[PDB]
Design a protein around this ligand. Structure first.
Ligand SMILES: [Cl-]
Ligand SMILES: [Cl-]
Ligand SMILES: [Cl-]
Ligand SMILES: [Cl-]
Ligand SMILES: [Cl-]
Ligand SMILES: [Cl-]
Ligand SMILES: [Cl-]
Ligand SMILES: [Cl-]
Ligand SMILES: [Cl-]
Ligand SMILES: [Cl-]
Ligand SMILES: [Cl-]
Ligand SMILES: [Cl-]
Ligand SMILES: [Cl-]
Ligand SMILES: [Cl-]
Ligand SMILES: [Cl-]
Ligand SMILES: [Cl-]
Lengths: 173, 173, 173, 173
């Protein structure tokens, strides 16, 4: 491919491009989740901020993958970005469940790429994912699960009241 | 009218005087809303502060209109100020709905003056309203709508509890 | 649509959603332009930084449109994001010409939305575009044109040499 | 071997000693490259500094390997250091190509040691190489490739002029 490319399979190169597309899709999903909670008829500004911050983190993930692709001598290829799965996201409970599902899918794609790298004997790819993605995803998913449990505990008691309290007393605003 | 007056119609001059009267009326309404929430039998001090601050903003709006009237070479004319529409304002929900209606009426008067200025080819009037009124009104109305949604969410759960929480955890105090 | 919506046409609401999609498309295009110049076989890091910064500005444009859509009581709707028009962008000259074409298309969409707002008598939309988009686009397009002229002057003399010099002595790095 | 040695194969111990010899050889090569560019008849002081800094980094690599060898309870063994492959290194283009070849050979030796560690089930060796060598080598090789492209772009235009410009405007001096 390149003067610099060394030990970098076409299979990993393509899988990295696909991972960029997944991260950018996830970023777009979080942009939609954030602006839904800014609606005047939803108006949970801590929830909007929580998802806007995730939008930024997923775009920064994609950018780190793209930097690595060029450092390896691979070639970035972009594809269309599919729109998010919903236009309206329901309650904070519904939204957090959607978010966990999303992150679990990202985490499965990271694990699938790690396994490809291991099959291709590409230790720099495995190190990169271990250094910058896999621990961050486990930590995020635990935080989301904690939030889900707290929202569940709250909305089981009194849904509107509970959703307000969660936004006010757990989420940053 | 004046050594300085230029491109400033009698129709806009009169409409500006009427707008001053509307802004001062709105200021008076917010003074009544604020002191109602300071009643010992209502006692929502964040709500009182929210409306007292709006009272001040509407009087500052009127004063900016008056400064502009004199900068254009128009003549300020004051009329009686009608008392606010209610003597007691109900719950925080009722009060916020009254406030949104009030602001929407101010915003319609601004839009009507903008349209007059455009019909009279008065771009300094249009710039002035765009610079100092129209965006501020859209922003305020969105904030009020956000508050309304949060109060609704709260009082649908448990009215007294919800009203206390909103005052404590959304409004500044 | 909403408790707050006032003077906000369905035609402008839809056109704003389309403008968000154009700005996000442009952001994606600039992401591809930036990472192309980071290729080891292209390696113009000031050019990469110039387009990455534009990527960020166009995503911030989209986010400002989305905030305004919610402030007006419109509803954000997202569509698929088409991939950029090229996978490889040629020389700095070719890339800057692509970028000017892109910005001129954004500027035409802004002008078309301004004209719709004027036809719908929506002065808050016109103020918003005048305050935050139209001057910034004219300024950017002039800068790009200046760059284009300098690159042309350089590559007409000695293409590789000239492209290096432009990157080193005009672009930030 | 030792009171402390645990899970540390003789095969990895020997391969580490060989890697020390390769890193010290590379350090010596970069010392020769640096002083060649300090010749009065070559006189590219940014190029001299670039290779002297690499000389230092490769000796620090060797020293880190030696510290790890002792931390594992292996025994350092030193062999003769072969002289660099050339006495005169040509142009900056020629020198950077020599340097990339050198670094690719170091990177292949690191990958070969990683594979040995994986075959021997030595995760501390794999972690050590991933923490301190493999990412640094990928980053260095990308930088060198970027430099190579820029030098090529320059010397294709006007060789002496281009080499001066690269030294002056890319390399630190
Ligand atoms: Cl392959
Ligand atoms: Cl396509
Ligand atoms: Cl690993
Ligand atoms: Cl806020
Ligand atoms: Cl007149
Ligand atoms: Cl009277
Ligand atoms: Cl105007
Ligand atoms: Cl107090
Ligand atoms: Cl309509
Ligand atoms: Cl679709
Ligand atoms: Cl305007
Ligand atoms: Cl840099
Ligand atoms: Cl052994
Ligand atoms: Cl010997
Ligand atoms: Cl490892
Ligand atoms: Cl010196």
């Amino acid at each position: 491919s390149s003067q610099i490319r060394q030990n970098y399979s076409t299979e990993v190169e393509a899988a990295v491009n696909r991972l960029v597309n997944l991260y950018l899709r996830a970023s777009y999903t979080y942009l939609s989740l954030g602006f839904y909670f800014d609606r005047d008829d939803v108006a949970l500004e801590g929830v909007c901020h929580f998802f806007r911050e995730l939008a930024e983190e997923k775009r920064e993930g994609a950018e780190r993958l793209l930097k690595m692709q060029n450092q390896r001598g691979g070639r970035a290829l972009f594809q269309d970005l599919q729109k998010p799965s919903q236009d309206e996201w329901g309650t904070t409970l519904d939204a957090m469940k959607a978010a966990i599902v999303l992150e679990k899918s990202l985490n499965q794609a990271l694990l699938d790429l790690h396994a490809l790298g291991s099959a291709q004997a590409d230790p720099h790819l495995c190190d990169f994912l271990e250094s910058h993605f896999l621990d961050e995803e486990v930590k995020l998913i635990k935080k989301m699960g904690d939030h889900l449990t707290n929202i569940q505990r709250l909305v089981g008691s009194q849904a509107g009241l509970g959703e307000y309290l969660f936004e006010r007393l757990t989420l940053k605003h």
